[PDB]
Amino acid sequence: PAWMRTLHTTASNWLHLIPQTLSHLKRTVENIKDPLFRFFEREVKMGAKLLQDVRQDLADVVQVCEGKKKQTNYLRTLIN
Amino acid sequence: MALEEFLKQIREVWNTYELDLVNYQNKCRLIRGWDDLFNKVKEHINSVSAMKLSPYYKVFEEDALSWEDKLNRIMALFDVWIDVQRRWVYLEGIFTGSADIKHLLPVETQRFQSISTEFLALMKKVSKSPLVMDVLNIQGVQRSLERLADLLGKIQKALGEYLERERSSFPRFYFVGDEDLLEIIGNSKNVAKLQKHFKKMFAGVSSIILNEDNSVVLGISSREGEEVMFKTPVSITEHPKINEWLTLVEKEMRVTLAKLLAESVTEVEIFGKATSIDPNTYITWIDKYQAQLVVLSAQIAWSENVETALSSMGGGGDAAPLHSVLSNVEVTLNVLADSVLMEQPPLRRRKLEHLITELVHQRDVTRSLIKSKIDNAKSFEWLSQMRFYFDPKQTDVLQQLSIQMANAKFNYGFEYLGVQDKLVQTPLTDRCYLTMTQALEARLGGSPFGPAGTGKTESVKALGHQLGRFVLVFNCDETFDFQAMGRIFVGLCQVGAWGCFDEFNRLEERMLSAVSQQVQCIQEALREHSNPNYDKTSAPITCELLNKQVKVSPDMAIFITMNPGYAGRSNLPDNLKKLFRSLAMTKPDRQLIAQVMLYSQGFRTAEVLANKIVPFFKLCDEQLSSQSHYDFGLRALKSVLVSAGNVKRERIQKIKREKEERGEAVDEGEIAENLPEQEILIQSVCETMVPKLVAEDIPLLFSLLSDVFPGVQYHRGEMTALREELKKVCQEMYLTYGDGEEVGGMWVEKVLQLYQITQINHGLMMVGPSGSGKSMAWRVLLKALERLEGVEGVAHIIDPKAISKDHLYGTLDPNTREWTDGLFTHVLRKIIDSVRGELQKRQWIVFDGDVDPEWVENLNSVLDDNKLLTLPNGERLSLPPNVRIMFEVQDLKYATLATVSRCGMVWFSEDVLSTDMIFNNFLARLRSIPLDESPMLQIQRDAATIMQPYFTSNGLVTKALEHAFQLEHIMDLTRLRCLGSLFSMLHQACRNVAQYNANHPDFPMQIEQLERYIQRYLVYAILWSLSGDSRLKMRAELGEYIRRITTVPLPTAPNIPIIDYEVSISGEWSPWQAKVPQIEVETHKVAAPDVVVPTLDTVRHEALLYTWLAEHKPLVLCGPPGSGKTMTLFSALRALPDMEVVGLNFSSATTPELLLKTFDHYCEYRRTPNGVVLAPVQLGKWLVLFCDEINLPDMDKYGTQRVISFIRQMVEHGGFYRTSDQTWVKLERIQFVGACNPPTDPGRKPLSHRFLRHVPVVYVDYPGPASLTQIYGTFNRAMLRLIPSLRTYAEPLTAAMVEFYTMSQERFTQDTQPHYIYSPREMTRWVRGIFEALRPLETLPVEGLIRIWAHEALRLFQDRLVEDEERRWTDENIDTVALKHFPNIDREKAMSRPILYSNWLSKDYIPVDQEELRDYVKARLKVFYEEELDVPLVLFNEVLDHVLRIDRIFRQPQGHLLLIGVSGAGKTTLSRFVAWMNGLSVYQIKVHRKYTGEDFDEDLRTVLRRSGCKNEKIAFIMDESNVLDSGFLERMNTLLANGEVPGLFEGDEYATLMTQCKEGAQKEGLMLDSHEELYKWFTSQVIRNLHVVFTMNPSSEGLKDRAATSPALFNRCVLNWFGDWS
Amino acid sequence: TSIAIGSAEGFNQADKAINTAVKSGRWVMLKNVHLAPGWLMQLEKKLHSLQPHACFRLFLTMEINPKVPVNLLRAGRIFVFEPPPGVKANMLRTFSSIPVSRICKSPNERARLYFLLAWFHAIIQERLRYAPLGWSKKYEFGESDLRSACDTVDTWLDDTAKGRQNISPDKIPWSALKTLMAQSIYGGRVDNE
């Protein structure tokens, strides 16, 4: 269908735009005493978690648009 | 022989025990000493039970049995006698002391006279023989007590009007409930029973002081103990009426407070205008007067001094005596500060704290005045401050004091507030006072809004206490309707009290609009009373409230506080907002509060501590990881400061004790200077905040503490006694205990944190994922505290979301305005009353369940400092100091910041409950508790020893569980679900070993056989528990992983996976294929509902289900529709003759009421000494409640399912709550089995992780092509034995069927249409149709068989299709499949496109030509027109096809239709036409505008009676337009799926149905007399006779919605898509 | 007869008041009728087949809401109350609302105080249109604030000027008015520093 192909192209472009990798920050005995690291670890943590979630969801959307996998309730809602 | 000795002791005690009797005004001799009898009976029962433990109990068993019997009779008799005695006592004082009730209410006056005569007769009989058994052996004594209680309750419930008149007589009675107001009125003579009712009637009066005669009221008292002595005592002898002397006490309280204030002001004038103050004299003055009076005297003195100083420099150029005022304030503040640095009595300490706060505010104000160079008394920089003016020359004492702010003037109400916690007068509080006073002067309300915990309600209460007013806090909600608020407003108007309606926006918008009227009228009355032209002689302004004229007192006001933007809040209409002066409270001055609080508690470094603690709180808010349960607002800081003060006091006491025990040298100054205040603050902060933190935030917060508080460390105390009690309790409950870093250190540390939080807060929240040990933690803590402190601890576990909020808190009848207690309200009221000594015990109310603002916001006042449960009827319940409110939740994703900030939090992570602890608990329970109820123990211990190496850290089980978390499961995988499945399967293995031993008495199982069997079954159980809820691929993957890591010998088979193998009792692997024989089904049993062709999946799932059900363990089968879940479960249940299955069919609107109706029908409640037990009516049988759509029920906006929570409560806790009388009901011989589609299917919701913890899930997927080939080849071979010539075609026929069904499933999916579901149900229907067509026929060539096959394929796969291209595809694919699998056949004869089969033209089901069928239908239509309905119809081919389909459906048992098509297409007419042919009687419900659910229930009852009792075939035609409510669809769902509605016939309607069914069975010739067999026969008759034809429009979203609200419409109803005319 | 709609007793009172006023010719006002759309439709049907008195008037004050039935809107005459288009219209509305006798009291400086208050109210309300720049949020600066400010001005002018015809501009309590309208009247709704 038309909407399936349009969403496939949009999701492919979005995957191209969004980067793929983000490594968490390492805990150290003297690093915890630094509030900069205390904030900075939280930033990289949230960034990596949300990036992984978004990448997985968009990959599932692309997979559905190609028909390889079935639609679920959450997947249907995200498509909508 | 100690058993006989103690039995003789108990015999002597009971024979010597007599009933203590005391007179009642020379009328009766009441029972006294209830507690002694109660605990005597309790101790005797416990002793007899402990004797039952002993083995020598057998020789005295029968005697001790009769002893427990009579002891239970004594308990039952006196569990009602005390209540009856109290009810008669306070009812007598109403029907005797009051004379107006005789004329007003004569009928129940005479009724009470008769009941009192009966009670005095029984009571004189008791007085004659005061022996306990002589009372007990009285004939019908228990029944007499029960009927007396019933009659007294009936009389009590009919006294509402008299109570309303009594409330009108004394205005303060409006805030007293019906029970308590009757208690007060009846017990007026006995004033000692009114002491516990004064706290709900006055601000700070908790009790009154009486002389020895109890006839003269000398004074009043507060909850702390502060006393006010009346100058003129009030005598109750002169004023016998309760209301009269209560009013006199109130007026005397006001006058004596005024006079004492005058004396205190005159005395404190010396302390003012004085350079130096002697500490002794000031302390004496403080101790002489009350806290409010000394604070008021200080305020008056300071205000007068400042006014005099300002008047002195009115000339501008004069001197500055304001510096003298500042110096005096500073000197007094220094004297106060030195006073608190040493030990003080608690009352004097609170007085000093209040004075220090007030004087700090005075110093700040005076400094501000000096800085601004204020020199005129009329300057607004001074007029804006709250100034107190005292006029001793005023004759009226109540008007001697005037409080002014800006242009507003108020009079002190002189209401005794007791000792209330004063708040620091921060600039925000000053702004609040200014705005609220400006609103009050303009005769408006107050609307302080903002986020939670910014000092809004407390600010309103503090302002009210500042003016000496009575402030009432009403926790508003959605049931505060127009009438309840009108009554509350009437009470406030008559009393003259302030009403602080916090959470005002929780009302409905319509209710707020309605209340705006009353608010406007009250404000107008206040405004007219404000005008000076009004005089005392002129009648007070009378506002009209609730169609009544109510006097309006000047002192009253309406304050509403609300949080804007929070969840579960409405909007205020503009006509209501214009009546209130709103104020924004967003940023309280936390630093000033902290500094002044630390200064008043005695901290020398208060400023530094506050400046270090407030930025610390901001750092915590902005630096720790964001979580839903984290709160760092003003409430958290308040708790921290209070805990710091308590810790400082305890440290001072400990130092003093160390000094007295070690020598004799104590100096208050030495201790004060040498005290680590920083350490105290850190200890309080850690005790309050560390428990709520996640694992990764603890080191972050500790580093933060080291950064802001360097050099100070926290050393948590070692509660050695509590740790010993925890160790003992864990040992008795088979729990793993560990100190520090041992196995279980984190859990016990969490328990200690929970204890510390309970010591501080009265509201707790144990937040953490399922299976983190919260329940065990708080249970172990409760038992340890009970066994340590010696105070019995009881717990009331309430599932808040398993019941409606009306059932949880209570309901108010809109008609009669009577209050019915909810669950939590009933529990709290029972604890408060303490009729059975509940106030001396540790009461914990645990709200185990999900939390949302709808139900938890009603507890805001309870969790606040108010500790009041405000009810819509104006009642308020004070939380006793021994009651704790606990919330055991898994997440806090839906609660607002109001609830999170109100409760201390303890966060339990899943790392708290390590897997080794669960393994140790399982092993201990296995080694201790017998499974039968000993060879059982020996087998259990041997097996546990065998499984010990695997149930270890980094063992086979742990590694397998870790890997199983990485696979894909149909339902979300939780550790505890897998562990519970494994433990249940291992228990079943132990029972299998025991059964093997029983079957072989001569040769029991040896050690080696046990080892082999246990190891192999452990691997088997791990495989089937960690991957039972996954596809075959994941099962094979887990099997391969186990084969790698495991060392135990596993099947040597090359490609066959391990899951294809069972563990025989001999201790060897045997493939499941050995239990799958090539059976030959009987010809007449082809595709029968109870016929199951054995396959590999069938036998595996049958064994698994038998294993799980033999443990009575709840389980859920999840899989696609038609996979075989119900069939497999019924096959497994057929191997258990002692289990009866009852079918439940959940829908989107399913509520626990369905389960309650099923319990009412199939079970019965019986009263037992341990409580109510619900058991099935049949004896020795286990009721298996089979819920077919367990995950379908609607999920609210807060992610909960009420029926799912109900099932979770009934599974985990083993019972539920009867909402009729709030009685705990324990389930007996009842287990639950669930069925559901995968949660990814539309309309299905994922089950809560707390529910999935208890229920194993087995994934029953579609049978494979090989399995389908086997099953339906067997079915065809059995079926094709009718025609011997056709026997050779069974193999190609089943192949063709399987191929076409596989193609149909792939081509049409649920993505296209909601009803496009295909399952082996279609194949079963195919085989049934072919067999039914072939049954009467004697011979038939292959072409006829292919024609029948094609016709059945068309009727199954093409009837439900929507588009034309899909039907064309189905026809073409049928043709291609038949030609592919059946070559060398003549296509034209067997596959002529108009495939029509009908039995109208012959006795058998044979093909019919189109034209002959059309002519026959024309003739039948002519007859139909002449007989039933004269509406001409035009006949075409589609009409013939449709009538053939309807005739096909109507001839089947339980054949229901779902006709989907545009209106006017003839669906109803064709249904009536076919039904008239087939003899069915057409029934249609006549829906009108007033048609409700009860009329539908009556129509259903009539149709079921006709279809089951009279054996009359009925075609119940029902249209979608006939659906008005969801109840219609729910009852239709139940009737379609089961054939009987459980709650439809009840009471009289049930008995008449029983009689009619008996008559019907007599007519059929059956011999049935029991209700169960007759009801089963009725259900069978309804199934056989009732057909439901459902017609609806082809809506797109409507079909999807109906696929969820009524799932049975798509599972039991054959779907025909008539559509529009082509 | 003004009745607040939303309760069953409110519906009964509205019915009785309308039935009485259609004969007696009195006015009836119902507030917040958008909360009962079905009763609104029933009321419209009742009104259509009715021949009331010549002086009878029925006012249905409601908020702009899509739930209001279309037939009632077609039956009645619609008046929209909303912010005035500009500063000039705002001042004109404020001066029209306040009675003339109230402004023209004994102190001749009362008129200038009222004019300053009206200009301040217009300035405050017009800044509301540009939500991010004029303020930080859509505050509810309405007619209630204007009435409260006028009452405060009256009270403090009568307190300072004891009935004198003229009062020196220095003696006018500027501090009182500024502090009150900054902290309680207009500053109450303000939640931002």
Ligand SMILES: Nc1ncnc2c1ncn2[C@@H]1O[C@H](COP(=O)(O)OP(=O)(O)OP(=O)(O)O)[C@@H](O)[C@H]1O
């Ligand atoms: N200290 C312990 N040592 C060993 N086993 C324990 C311990 N505490 C709990 N368990 C076991 O682990 C499981 C946890 O049960 P519990 O009811 O305490 O969980 P929970 O965290 O309250 O769960 P939910 O959120 O579902 O209410 C039970 O099987 C219990 O027997």
Ligand SMILES: Nc1ncnc2c1ncn2[C@@H]1O[C@H](COP(=O)(O)OP(=O)(O)O)[C@@H](O)[C@H]1O
């Ligand atoms: N000036 C103050 N001095 C001391 N404690 C205060 C002060 N203002 C607020 N608090 C405390 O802050 C909390 C606010 O309670 P409350 O006003 O009832 O909450 P809410 O603002 O949500 O209605 C209470 O613990 C209260 O004692």
Ligand SMILES: Nc1ncnc2c1ncn2[C@@H]1O[C@H](COP(=O)(O)OP(=O)(O)O)[C@@H](O)[C@H]1O
């Ligand atoms: N091994 C088997 N032998 C015979 N029939 C089977 C077998 N497996 C599946 N079926 C057929 O599949 C259907 C399963 O339907 P049902 O038990 O209602 O599943 P669900 O309750 O999950 O919808 C039954 O009608 C049955 O005839």
Ligand SMILES: Nc1ncnc2c1ncn2[C@@H]1O[C@H](COP(=O)(O)OP(=O)(O)O)[C@@H](O)[C@H]1O
């Ligand atoms: N085949 C037909 N020929 C002539 N009239 C028909 C035919 N089918 C339906 N009708 C008309 O439809 C009307 C009945 O509609 P009905 O079956 O009640 O609609 P629905 O199927 O939506 O319930 C009758 O008055 C009849 O005239």
Ligand SMILES: [Mg+2]
């Ligand atoms: Mg639990």
